[PDB]
Design a binder for these strands. Structure first.
Ligand SMILES: Nc1ncnc2c1ncn2[C@@H]1O[C@H](COP(=O)(O)OP(=O)(O)OP(O)(O)=S)[C@@H](O)[C@H]1O
Ligand SMILES: Nc1ncnc2c1ncn2[C@@H]1O[C@H](COP(=O)(O)OP(=O)(O)OP(O)(O)=S)[C@@H](O)[C@H]1O
Ligand SMILES: Nc1ncnc2c1ncn2[C@@H]1O[C@H](COP(=O)(O)OP(=O)(O)O)[C@@H](O)[C@H]1O
Ligand SMILES: [Mg+2]
Ligand SMILES: [Mg+2]
Lengths: 161, 282, 327, 338, 439
DNA sequence: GATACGAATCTTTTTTTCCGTATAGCCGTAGC
DNA sequence: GCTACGGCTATACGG
DNA sequence: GATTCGTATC
C-alpha cells in the first residue's frame, strides 16, 4: 500500500464534509492535507478537532490548533544557507515551541538519511556530526548550545574551509 | 571391589526407618548422593560443593550382612548414585511389606560406572514375584573421596539446645513451633534467637515482622546466639526432627547452624548431622 | 494538610481555569467536553508545562464524583509491559460504564517510557474499544512512541510557559503566602524559570526561606541570586568586557575574583555568556562557529568534570580566539 | 623460587631505595589507629606492593605474608557463577580486577560487605582496572565503613581513578629508583649468590635497560646468569621481552614499507600481540616510543606520530574494539611518513 | 479452486526444480543411507525457502522406500502442533523419535523433520540437541534414515535487549545445531541454492501452457513471456514465483508484479558496501535500502570487523594509503559512538564513498574473509588458562602473588626461560605462556 | 569454439518477556 | 468418622 | 557482491 495522494485524501475529506455539513475553506482543506502528510486518520483527527474547536475550517484556525510537521521544519533548518538563519529557525521553531533536543536530533538524522540534492561526502559528514551530537545529548548534555554547535559544524562542512 | 549387603525391614524396624529417612532427606535435598561404604560403617553424604551438607552415619550392624572388600584403605568403596532410583526402589520395598511380607532385600555391586543389583521378593495372596532393579552409579576415585570431608564445627561460641523428644508431652507443641514459620509463602530467611532457655523464630522484613517464641520447657546440654538461614533448610530440619527422638540443635553466633539427630540403637548409634551455613550476615 | 506540602505540589491546579499558559489547548478541550465528544488526546511538551495538571483537571471536570472508577491512570512507576497492557487495560476498557454513561478515561502518563510491544498491543485496544473508552497519552519525547500510536492520537503541543502566565501564577502565590516581590526579582525569576513552573515555585519557596522574617520583607534580585547561586547580569557583563577588551592576566584576575566573590559556577557563566553573545552582531560567521564549537566542548568537558581553572582559561582563550576572526 | 621474591624486603627497615618514602611510611605506622585510606601511585615495578606489605608488617607484626589462597563464588544480577580467587592473610585481604571484567562491581561489593561486617586492611592491586561502578560502590563503602576496614590500593597512572575516590584517600607517590640504586641492589643479590660478575658496567647496563624497574632488572639478571652457565660477561647481550622485539620489528617494517599489504601484515602482528593477552594501551605506547627512537625520522614526523598517538590512545580509552584504533594509528603513521 | 503451487506439484523426479548435480549428490547420499551398514546416519538439508528441499525428498522416498522395504512408500513427517494429553511439550520430539526408531525392517519409512520443535525456547532447543546427538551416537545395529530440512531465514527483531543469541538473530543450521552435531562423521550436509532462472522459466512456462485457455481468455497469453522472465529474474523461490504468476493471471487489471524480498547475506552485504551494487548507481539509496531491509546484520560489531578485514581486497591491496587511513580512521571514530545507528550509517557511507572515488575499470579484486577475532579470543582464553595455572603453581609451592598484568608483560617470557635453564642445567611450566610471539 | 550461466566459497563465540517445567499446597477417597 | 497419601492445580523460577 | 572452475547453449 502506497502513501495516500492529496487528491484521494481531499475526496474522502470532502465526502466527510458533505456528510457532516460543516463550514470549510479550500485553504483550510489544503492546510489539513499538508499537515496530514498522507495519513488519512491524522487528516480526519485534525479536521474533527478543528471543527469541534473553532467551527469554520480555514488556514488560520487549523494552523492555530495543529502544528506544521517538524520533519519539514528540521529539513528547512538543515538546508539553510547561512548559520544565522538556521540558528534563528531552530530557536524560534523548535526551542520556543517546546520540542525536545533528542527529538530534534533524531529528526535531523532521519532528514539527513532522506535528504536529496546533497553530496555523499557532505551527507556522511553531517551524519557523523549528528551522531556526535546525539551521543552528547544521550550522555546528559542536552542544552541548546549543543544544537547550535551542531548547526555551526554542519554549516562549516557545507561551506568548506 | 566386591560389595554386597542384605536389608530386612521387618527384622529391625528402627535402623530401617533411619535408612529410609536418610534416603528421603538426600532425595529432597538435591539430586545424586555419595555413598561411602567403609568396612565398619556406611556414610551417606550430600555435598553440593552456602547450601547445607547432610552427613549421616549408618553402622554395619544395621544390615544383616555387610561384606565390603576393596583395594583402597579400610575397604572404602565410594559411589555416586541417583537418589530418585534408590528412592523408588525403597518405596517399592516398603510397599512390599505394607501389602504383607517379610522378604529380605539383597543388594550386590554388579559391574568407572557400575550398578547395584537390588533384588527382593514379594508374595501376593502364595505367588512368587521377583523384583529386580539396576541403579546406574559411578565409582568415585580415592583422591576424589579424600576431597570430601566432614566440616568441623568450632565450639568458641557454639551453644547446644536439647530439643524435646517428639514422643513426649511437649514434642507435638515443639513440632508445631518449628513448622509455625513454614505456613508463610513469602519467607526466605529465618533469623534465630537464643539468649542465655528460649528459641525465637524472627522473620524481619521491610513492612512485616514475626516473633514466634517457644514458651515451653527446654534443655541446653552442658550470651546471645543469632544466625539467619534459608527456609528450605528449616524444612529439612523439621522433617528430621519428626523422625528422630534425640534431636540436638547447635547455634553459632553469625557463623552456622548444626542440626544433630541421633538414634540410640544400644551398639553403635546411628547419627544424622545437617550442617547449615548462614544465608547472610546479621 | 496543604500547608505541609512543597510549593510544587501545593499549587497544582484543580480546575481547568486554574491552568495558565496553554490557552488554546484548554479552550479546545473545553469545547470538546461541552460538545460531548472527546478524541484520543495526546499531550506533548517540555517538563513543567502543565500536562498532568491539565488532564487531571479535565478528568475531574468530566467525572465530578466518579473519578475513582471512571479514570485509570498508569505511569512509569507501575509496570506497563505486554502483560499489563494485555490484561488490565483490556479489562478496564472492555466492561460497560457503571452509571455515569459518557466514556471511560485511560491516562498513560510518561508513555515514552513504554516498550514498543506494549504500544503495538495498545494501538488495537485504542482503535477497538473507542466507542466507550478514550485514551490520553502524555510524553516529553515523541521519538520514543510508535508512529501508529501518534497516528491514532490527536496531538496537542504544550508550549513553554509565556511571561504572562508566570506573572499570574506568581501573583497568585504571593497573594496566598502574603509575600512581596520586587519587579527586578520578578524579571530574574522568569528568566531562570525557562518556561518551567516547578522551578519558579521551588525558587520562590527557597527565597521565602531565605528571608529572616518572611513578612514585612521584600524579595529582591539579590535574594534570588543568593538562594539559587546564579551570577548577576552585571557580573556576566563585567566578565565579558574583561575577556573582550582587557589583556590575559587581568581578564583571568577578573574571572577569578568574580567567581570567588560569591562561589559562582563556571557553567552558569558559560550559559550567561552564550545568552549575551547571541544578541551580538557578528559580521564574519566564523566567529559564531568558533564560539559555538569551543563553548560546546568546554561545556561538555565541564559536564564530565576536570580542572576548573583550566576550563576557565579555556573559556577566555576560546572567546578571544573566536573574536580575533572579526579582526 | 625466582630471585625477585628471594630478595624482597619483608620489613619496613629493609627498604633501602626511597629513604624519604620509608620515613613517611614509618610516620604513618607510628599510630595506626588514625591511619586513613592509602593510594600508592608510581612507575610499575618500583616496589609499591613491597612497601604496602612492609607497612602491614610494621602495623600487624610479622605474619602478614602467611597467605592462604581461597576460592570464592559470586552471582551477578542473572544466574552466573564467578570463581574469584581470594589470597587472604591475618588482618589482610587481596583483591585484583585482573581476572574479572565488567562484573568487577558485585564481587568487590560482596567481599567488602562481608569483611566490613582495630580494623582489617584490604589491598586492591591495579586500581585502574575498575569500570567506574565498583568505584561508585567503593566510595560509599569506605566512607561509611571506615571504622572496621581500611583500603590500600596500588596503581600506576591514576588518571582513570574517579575524583571522589582520590578525594577520599591519602595520595602517596613512589618514585622509581636511580640506576645506581638498582646497581646496588643487584650487587647485593650477586654478593648473596656469586655470579662471577666480571665488570660492574653490566649491572649498570641492566639497570638502564629496565628504565627503573626492579622486577625486570632482576629477571634479566637471573636470565643472563642461567644462560651464561652461572657466570656473566662484559659483552653478554641484553635480554629483552619477546613482545618488545616483535614491536621493534613492527616499527622497522612500518618505517621501511608503507603500503596496504604492509598494513595487513602489521594488522596480523597486532592480532598476534592481542592474542598474547598484551593490553592494547601499552602496545600503542611501546609502538609510539619505538617509532620515536628511529633516527631516520625528522622532527615533523615525530610530532605527527605523537599527536596521532595521543588521539588514538584517547580513542582506545573511549573505545570497545582495540584493533580499530591500533590499525588507525599505524595507517596514520604510514600516511605521515610517506 | 486450488492454489497453483499445490495443484501443479511435481509427480515425479523430472518435474522437480533442482539442479542435475544437486539431484545426483542427494540421490547418492540417500541411496547410501538406505544400506544395511550406512556410514552416514542422518541427512541435513540447508537452504533458503522454496528451494525444493522438502519435495525432492518426497519424490525420492516414493522410489527408494518401496525398493529397500522388506516383504511381509512415503515419509514419516514430524508434526509439532500435536498436543497429546500425557505428553509434556519438550517430550513430544523424544516420543516421536522413539516411535519412529521402529521403522527398520518390514516397516521401513524415511523420517522427514521439516518443521522442527520450538527451538526459540532454550530448554527444548538443548533437548533437541541432546536428542539428535543420541541418534548419531546410538548403539542401535540399524536405524531408519533421518532427513532434517532447515530453512535458512533471518529472524526479525522482536524484543529489545543485548542478550540476543545466534538463534535470535538468524534461523540457520549453525545456530540450531552445535559444533558436535555439524562436525560428525555420521552426518552428511547438502546445502541448497535458490532455483536458477532457467528452471524457473521452464516451470513457469509449463504452468502457463497447462492453463492456456485461461490466459488466452484474458488476452494475457501474448504478455506471459515477459512476466515469466521478470518473475524468474526477481526471485529464486519456486513457490513465491508460482503464487505471483497465479496472482497475475487471475488479475484483470494493471496491478504491478511484486514478489517477496530475500535478505542479503553477510558476505553479500560486505561486497555491496565495498564494491557497490549494480543497477543502483546512487550510493545513498543503496545504503538506505540495505539499512532498512538488513538492519539486524548491519547493526552488529561483526560487520564493522568484516569491513576492516576485507577492505584491503578491493584491488588486492593496490590503492593509496590515504584511502586506507581514512577508512580505518572512520571505523575507529565509529567505534566510539556506543553502537548508535549514526555510527553504522557514517561508517558504511564513508567506506562506500572512498571505494567509489578510487574505483576504476579492469580492477581485479580479491577474496573476502570472516574476521579472525574469534581465533584471537580463543588464544586469549588459552593464555588465561595457562596464566591461571602459573599463578596456581606459584601460589602453592611458595608464597608469591603476581598480577596477571605482570604475567602477560614479563613473567610470560622470562619465567619459562628461568625454568628452562634451571631444569636442563639441573618448575612444571617450561614453555612460553600462550606460545611464542612470531613476527 | 566463445560465452552466458551456475555452483562453491568467502563465517562465527539492564530489561522484558515467554514458554514450558518444577514444586508445594489443597481436596477427594481408601483404610484403619 | 478421621487421617494419610495420591492426583490436580496455581505460582515462582530459569534460560 | 566478488573470484574461480565447470557446463550447456548458441
Ligand atoms: N500552566 C500551569 N498553571 C499552573 N501551574 C502549573 C502550570 N504548569 C505547571 N504548573 C505547576 O507545576 C506543577 C508540575 O506540573 P505537572 O503538570 O504536574 O507536570 P508536567 O507539566 O506534566 O511535566 P512532566 O512532563 O510530567 S515532568 C503542577 O503541579 C503545578 O503546580
Ligand atoms: N516444479 C516444481 N518444483 C518444485 N516445487 C514445486 C514445483 N511445482 C510446484 N511446487 C511446489 O512448490 C513448493 C516448494 O516447497 P519446498 O521448497 O519443497 O518446501 P521447502 O523447501 O521446505 O521450503 P520452506 O522452507 O518449507 S518455505 C511445494 O509446495 C511444491 O509442491
Ligand atoms: N627496597 C628494595 N630493595 C630491594 N628490592 C626491592 C625493594 N623494593 C622493591 N624491590 C623488589 O621489587 C620486586 C617487585 O616489586 P613490586 O612491589 O611488584 O613493584 P610494584 O608494587 O610497583 O608492582 C620485589 O621482588 C622486590 O625484590
Ligand atoms: Mg507528569
Ligand atoms: Mg516444504
Amino acid at each position: 500500500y502506497s502513501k495516500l495522494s492529496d487528491e484521494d485524501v481531499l475526496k474522502r475529506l470532502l465526502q466527510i464534509i458533505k456528510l457532516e455539513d460543516v463550514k470549510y475553506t479550500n485553504d483550510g482543506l489544503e492546510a489539513i492535507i499538508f499537515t496530514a502528510e498522507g495519513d488519512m486518520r491524522q487528516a480526519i483527527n485534525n479536521l474533527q478537532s478543528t471543527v469541534a474547536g473553532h467551527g469554520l475550517v480555514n488556514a488560520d484556525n487549523v494552523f492555530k490548533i495543529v502544528d506544521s510537521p517538524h520533519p519539514l521544519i528540521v529539513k528547512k533548518m538543515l538546508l539553510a544557507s547561512n548559520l544565522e538563519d538556521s540558528i534563528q529557525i531552530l530557536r524560534t521553531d523548535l526551542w520556543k515551541k517546546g520540542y525536545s533536543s533528542i527529538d530534534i536530533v533524531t529528526t535531523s538524522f532521519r532528514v539527513t538519511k532522506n535528504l536529496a540534492q546533497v553530496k555523499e561526502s557532505v551527507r556522511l559528514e553531517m551524519i557523523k556530526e549528528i551522531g556526535l551530537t546525539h551521543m552528547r545529548i544521550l550522555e546528559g548534555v542536552g542544552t541548546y548550545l549543543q544544537l547550535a554547535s551542531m548547526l555551526a559544524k554542519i554549516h562549516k562542512l557545507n561551506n568548506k574551509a | 571391589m566386591k560389595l554386597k549387603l542384605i536389608v530386612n525391614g521387618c527384622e529391625a524396624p528402627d535402623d530401617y526407618k533411619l535408612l529410609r529417612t536418610t534416603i528421603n532427606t538426600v532425595a529432597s535435598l538435591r539430586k545424586t548422593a555419595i555413598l561411602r561404604f567403609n568396612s565398619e560403617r556406611l556414610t551417606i553424604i550430600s555435598t553440593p560443593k552456602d547450601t547445607g551438607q547432610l552427613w549421616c552415619t549408618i553402622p554395619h550392624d544395621v544390615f544383616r550382612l555387610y561384606t565390603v572388600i576393596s583395594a583402597r584403605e579400610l575397604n572404602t568403596i565410594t559411589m555416586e548414585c541417583n537418589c530418585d532410583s534408590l528412592l523408588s526402589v525403597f518405596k517399592r520395598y516398603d510397599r512390599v511389606m505394607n501389602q504383607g511380607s517379610s522378604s529380605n532385600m539383597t543388594i550386590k555391586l554388579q559391574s568407572p560406572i557400575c550398578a547395584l543389583g537390588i533384588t527382593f521378593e514379594e508374595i501376593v495372596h502364595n505367588k512368587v514375584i521377583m523384583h529386580s532393579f539396576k541403579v546406574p552409579v559411578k565409582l568415585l576415585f580415592r583422591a576424589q573421596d579424600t576431597r570430601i570431608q566432614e566440616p568441623m564445627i568450632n565450639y568458641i561460641q557454639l551453644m547446644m539446645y536439647k530439643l524435646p523428644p517428639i514422643s513426649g508431652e511437649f514434642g507435638s507443641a515443639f513440632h508445631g513451633f518449628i513448622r509455625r514459620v513454614e505456613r508463610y509463602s513469602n519467607v526466605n530467611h529465618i533469623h534465630l534467637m537464643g539468649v542465655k532457655v528460649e528459641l525465637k523464630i524472627i522473620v524481619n522484613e521491610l513492612d512485616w515482622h514475626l516473633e514466634i517464641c517457644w514458651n515451653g520447657p527446654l534443655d541446653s546440654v552442658i550470651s546471645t546466639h543469632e544466625v539467619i538461614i534459608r527456609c528450605k533448610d528449616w524444612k529439612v530440619c523439621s522433617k528430621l526432627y519428626a523422625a528422630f527422638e534425640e534431636v540436638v540443635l547447635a547455634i553459632s553466633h553469625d557463623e552456622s547452624c548444626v542440626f544433630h539427630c541421633s538414634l540410640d540403637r544400644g551398639r553403635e548409634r546411628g547419627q544424622i548431622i545437617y550442617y547449615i551455613a548462614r544465608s547472610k550476615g546479621l | 494538610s496543604k500547608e505541609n506540602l512543597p510549593w510544587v505540589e501545593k499549587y497544582r491546579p484543580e480546575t481547568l481555569d486554574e491552568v495558565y499558559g496553554q490557552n488554546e489547548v484548554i479552550t479546545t478541550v473545553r469545547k470538546f467536553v461541552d460538545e460531548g465528544k472527546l478524541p484520543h488526546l495526546l499531550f506533548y511538551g517540555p517538563p513543567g508545562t502543565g500536562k498532568t495538571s491539565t488532564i487531571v483537571a479535565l478528568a475531574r471536570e468530566i467525572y465530578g464524583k466518579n473519578y475513582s472508577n471512571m479514570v485509570l491512570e498508569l505511569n512509569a512507576s507501575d509496570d506497563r509491559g505486554i502483560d499489563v497492557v494485555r490484561n488490565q487495560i483490556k479489562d478496564f476498557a472492555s466492561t460497560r460504564q457503571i452509571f455515569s454513561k459518557g466514556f471511560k478515561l485511560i491516562i498513560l502518563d510518561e508513555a515514552d517510557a513504554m516498550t514498543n510491544a506494549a504500544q503495538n498491543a495498545l494501538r488495537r485496544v485504542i482503535e477497538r474499544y473507542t466507542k466507550n473508552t478514550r485514551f490520553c497519552v502524555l510524553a516529553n519525547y515523541a521519538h520514543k512512541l510508535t508512529p501508529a500510536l501518534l497516528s491514532r492520537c490527536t496531538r496537542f503541543r504544550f508550549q513553554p510557559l509565556p511571561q504572562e502566565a508566570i506573572e499570574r501564577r506568581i501573583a497568585n502565590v504571593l497573594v496566598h503566602e502574603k509575600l512581596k516581590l520586587s519587579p527586578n526579582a520578578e524579571k530574574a525569576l522568569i528568566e531562570l524559570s525557562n518556561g518551567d513552573m516547578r522551578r519558579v515555585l521551588n525558587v520562590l519557596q527557597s527565597c521565602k526561606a531565605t528571608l529572616d522574617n518572611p513578612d514585612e520583607d521584600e524579595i529582591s534580585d539579590d535574594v534570588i541570586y543568593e538562594c539559587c547561586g546564579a551570577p548577576r547580569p552585571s557580573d556576566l557583563k563585567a566578565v565579558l568586557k574583561s575577556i573582550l577588551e582587557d589583556d590575559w592576566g587581568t581578564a583571568h584576575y577578573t574571572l577569578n575574583k568574580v567567581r570567588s566573590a560569591k562561589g559562582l559556577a563556571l557553567i552558569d557563566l558559560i550559559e550567561g555568556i552564550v545568552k549575551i553573545l547571541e544578541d551580538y552582531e557578528l559580521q564574519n560567521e566564523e566567529t559564531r562557529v568558533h564560539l559555538l564549537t569551543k563553548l560546546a566542548d568546554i561545556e561538555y568537558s565541564i559536564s564530565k568534570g576536570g580542572n576548573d581553572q583550566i576550563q576557565g582559561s579555556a573559556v577566555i582563550g576560546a572567546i578571544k580566539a573566536s573574536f580575533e576572526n572579526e579582526t | 623460587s625466582l630471585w625477585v621474591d628471594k630478595y624482597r624486603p619483608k620489613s619496613l627497615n629493609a627498604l633501602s631505595h626511597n629513604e624519604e618514602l620509608t620515613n613517611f611510611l614509618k610516620s604513618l605506622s607510628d599510630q595506626p589507629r588514625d591511619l586513613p585510606h592509602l593510594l600508592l601511585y608510581g612507575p610499575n615495578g618500583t616496589g609499591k606492593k613491597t612497601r604496602c606489605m612492609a607497612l602491614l608488617e610494621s602495623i600487624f607484626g610479622p605474619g602478614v605474608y602467611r597467605l592462604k589462597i581461597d576460592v570464592r563464588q559470586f552471582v551477578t544480577a542473572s544466574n552466573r557463577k564467578l570463581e574469584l580467587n581470594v589470597v587472604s592473610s591475618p588482618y589482610h585481604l587481596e583483591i585484583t580486577p585482573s581476572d574479572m571484567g565488567n562484573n568487577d562491581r558485585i564481587v568487590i561489593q560482596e567481599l567488602l560487605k562481608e569483611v566490613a561486617q582495630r580494623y582489617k586492611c584490604v589491598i586492591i592491586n591495579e586500581a585502574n582496572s575498575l569500570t567506574k561502578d565498583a568505584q561508585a560502590a567503593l566510595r560509599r563503602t569506605m566512607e561509611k565503613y571506615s571504622k572496621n576496614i581500611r583500603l590500600i590500593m596500588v596503581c600506576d597512572s591514576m588518571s582513570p581513578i574517579i575524583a571522589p575516590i582520590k578525594s577520599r584517600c591519602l595520595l602517596i607517590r613512589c618514585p622509581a629508583p636511580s640506576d645506581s640504586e638498582i646497581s646496588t641492589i643487584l650487587s647485593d643479590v650477586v654478593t648473596n649468590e656469586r655470579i662471577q660478575l666480571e665488570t660492574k658496567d653490566i649491572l649498570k647496563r641492566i639497570a638502564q635497560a629496565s628504565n627503573g624497574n626492579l622486577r625486570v632488572s632482576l629477571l634479566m639478571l637471573e636470565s643472563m646468569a642461567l644462560n651464561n652457565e652461572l657466570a656473566l660477561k662484559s659483552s653478554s647481550p641484553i635480554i629483552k621481552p619477546d613482545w618488545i622485539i616483535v614491536i621493534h620489528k613492527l616499527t622497522r617494517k612500518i618505517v621501511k614499507e608503507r603500503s596496504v599489504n604492509s598494513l595487513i601484515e602489521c594488522r596480523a602482528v597486532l592480532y598476534d600481540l592481542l592474542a598474547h593477552c598484551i593490553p592494547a594501551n601499552i602496545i600503542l605506547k611501546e609502538l609510539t616510543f619505538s617509532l620515536l627512537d628511529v633516527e631516520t625520522l625528522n622532527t615533523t614526523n615525530k610530532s605527527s606520530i605523537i599527536e596521532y598517538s595521543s588521539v588514538f590512545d584517547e580513542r582506545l580509552s573511549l573505545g570497545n574494539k582495540a584493533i580499530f584504533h591500533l590499525e588507525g594509528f599505524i595507517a596514520k603513521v604510514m600516511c605521515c611518513l610517506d | 479452486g486450488e492454489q497453483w503451487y499445490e495443484k501443479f506439484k511435481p509427480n515425479c523426479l523430472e518435474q522437480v526444480a533442482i539442479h542435475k548435480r544437486k539431484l545426483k549428490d542427494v540421490q547418492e547420499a540417500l541411496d547410501a543411507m538406505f544400506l544395511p551398514n550406512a556410514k552416514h546416519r542422518i541427512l541435513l538439508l540447508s537452504g533458503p525457502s522454496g528451494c525444493s528441499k522438502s519435495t525432492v525428498i518426497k519424490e525420492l522416498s516414493k522410489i527408494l522406500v518401496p525398493k529397500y522395504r522388506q516383504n511381509s512408500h512415503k515419509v514419516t513427517e514430524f508434526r509439532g502442533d500435536c498436543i497429546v494429553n500425557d505428553l509434556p511439550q519438550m517430550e513430544s520430539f523424544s516420543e516421536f523419535l522413539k516411535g519412529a526408531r521402529y521403522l527398520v525392517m518390514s516397516n521401513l519409512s524415511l523420517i522427514l523433520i521439516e518443521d522442527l520443535p520450538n527451538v526459540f525456547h532454550i530448554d527444548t532447543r538443548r533437548r533437541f540437541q541432546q536428542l539428535i546427538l543420541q541418534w548419531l551416537y546410538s548403539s542401535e545395529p540399524l536405524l531408519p534414515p533421518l532427513v532434517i530440512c532447515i530453512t535458512e531465514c533471518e529472524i526479525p527483531e522482536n524484543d529489545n535487549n543485548y542478550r540476543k543469541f545466534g538463534i535470535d538473530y538468524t534461523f540457520s543450521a549453525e545456530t540450531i545445531m552445535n559444533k558436535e552435531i555439524l562436525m560428525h562423521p555420521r552426518l552428511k550436509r547438502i546445502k541448497f541454492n535458490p532455483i536458477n532462472s532457467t528452471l524457473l522459466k521452464k516451470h513457469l512456462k509449463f504452468i502457463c501452457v497447462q492453463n492456456m485457455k485461461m490466459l488466452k481468455e484474458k488476452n494475457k497469453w501474448n504478455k506471459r513471456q515477459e512476466v515469466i522472465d521478470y518473475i524468474a529474474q526477481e526471485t529464486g523461490d519456486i513457490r513465491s514465483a508460482i503464487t505471483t504468476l497465479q496472482f497475475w493471471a487471475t488479475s484483470s487489471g494493471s496491478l504491478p508484479i511484486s514478489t517477496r524480498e530475500s535478505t542479503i547475506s553477510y558476505f553479500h552485504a560486505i561486497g555491496k558496501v565495498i564494491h557497490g551494487s549494480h543497477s543502483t548507481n546512487n550510493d545513498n539509496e543503496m545504503i538506505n535500502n540495505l539499512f532498512e531491509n538488513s538492519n539486524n546484520l548491519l547493526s552488529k560489531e561483526d560487520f564493522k570487523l568484516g569491513i576492516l578485514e576485507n577492505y584491503n581486497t578491493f584491488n588486492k591491496g593496490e590503492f593509496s594509503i590515504s584511502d586506507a587511513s581514512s577508512i580505518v580512521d572512520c571505523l575507529s571514530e565509529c567505534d566510539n559512538m556506543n553502537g548508535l545507528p549514526e555510527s553504522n550509517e557514517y561508517g558504511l557511507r564513508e567506506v562506500r564513498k572512498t571505494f567509489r572515488n578510487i574505483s576504476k575499470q579492469g580492477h581485479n579484486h580479491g577474496t573476502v574473509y570472516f574476521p579472525r577475532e574469534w581465533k584471537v579470543r580463543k588464544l586469549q582464553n588459552s593464555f588465561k588458562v595457562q596464566a591461571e595455572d602459573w599463578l596456581n603453581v606459584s601460589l602453592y609451592k611458595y608464597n608469591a602473588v603476581h598480577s596477571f598484568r605482570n604475567i602477560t608483560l614479563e613473567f610470560g617470557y622470562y619465567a619459562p626461560l628461568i625454568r628452562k635453564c634451571q631444569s636442563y642445567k639441573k618448575i612444571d611450566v617450561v614453555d612460553r605462556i600462550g606460545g611464542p610471539i612470531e613476527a
